[PDB]
Amino acid sequence: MNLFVALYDFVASGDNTLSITKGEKLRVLGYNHNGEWCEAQTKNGQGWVPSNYITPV
Incomplete structure (x- = not known):
């Protein structure tokens, strides 16, 4: 799912x-x-997060 x-x-x-x-x-x-x-969507909502706080699965 390219999460x-x-x-x-x-x-x-x-x-x-x-x-x-x-x-x-x-x-x-x-x-x-x-x-x-990074604009993102999670099960909790939608909005911006720092790019360095996430990575591809």
């Missing part, structure tokens, strides 16, 4: 970003212009 998995916990601040827990699986939708942030 990614969370390497570290990330908690959002504001409504653009998305909280993730280590081990969580994600559908990566895209990256921002410099690749620093």
